[PDB]
């Protein structure tokens, strides 16, 4: 699953962690097996304004 | 997003991989470092099992 999030919200994608993006529009289990890969990309997403 | 946002407000692209291990018909796995061939010497071989 690929998408884009904010900076201080990368912490909410973790097993068993509650928040505002995890509890409202994307939530992964507490018994999750796999892993996550995030690399800062604000060179292709931020516009002037 | 704008190019003046702090690192906490910057966009971040993220990919999460979710596996499955229960009853799996192994379909996606493989390094398979290919055997270099040796001839005419009594050698330990293991061809595809």
């Amino acid at each position, epitope marked *: 699953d690929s998408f884009v999030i904010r900076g201080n919200e990368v912490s909410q994608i973790a097993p068993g962690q509650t928040g505002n993006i995890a509890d409202y529009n994307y939530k992964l289990p507490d018994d999750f097996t796999g892993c996550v890969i995030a690399w800062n990309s604000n*060179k292709l997403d*931020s516009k*002037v*304004g | 997003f*704008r*190019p003046t946002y*702090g690192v906490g407000h910057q966009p971040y692209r993220v990919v999460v991989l979710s596996f499955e291990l229960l009853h799996a018909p192994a379909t996606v796995c493989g390094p398979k470092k290919s055997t270099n061939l040796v001839k005419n010497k009594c050698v330990n071989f293991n061809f595809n099992g």
Partner: antibody
Amino acid sequence: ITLKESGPTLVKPTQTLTLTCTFSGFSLSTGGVSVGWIRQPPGKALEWLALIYWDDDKRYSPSLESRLTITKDTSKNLVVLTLTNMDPVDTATYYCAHKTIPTIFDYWGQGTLVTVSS
Amino acid sequence: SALTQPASVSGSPGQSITISCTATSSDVGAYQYVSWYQQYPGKAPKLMIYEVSKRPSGVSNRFSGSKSGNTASLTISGLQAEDDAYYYCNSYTTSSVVFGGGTKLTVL
């Protein structure tokens, strides 16, 4: 990478000035890439004009917006800026540069001198 | 008003010189990306440095940026007569990219 501006060198008061910027080596289809226009009066500092993103999200200068609709065509690699209501202030150089998010204006063009008088 | 650049500086050939692009305007945003552009005498501007403390590979080793707060002290070591040209700075504000008042660099 190359860009090139073109258009009328001379123009009369209150007329529609048109300019065509032809580029080669890159396109306006990849993410992040955009192309904007900038002018510089003779012996003066630069100024912004407009900006057209690759997704057809467009930006104009705040003070002089609601005009100069900048369109483009990435098929023949051409961007077009057209600004109406010629004033004698509008006599300046004009450049069409490709803009990235960190490397602001990394690919500039040539520039065309335009005069506003009888 | 938004940015600010000095009129001119004149350094003897073979020495160092630093140039400042003070903003002299509050709330230019985070002031993290600050680029400098080299304006030739009547030629298309060439990018000299972007990401102030960075410098793009392909140019000399004398230009170097810094930030003393609200300005960018771009430094140039070993001044040679080739460095005579015009200079501008560029950094986004909260609403839109802004430019400097212009700077002249004459080697003497």
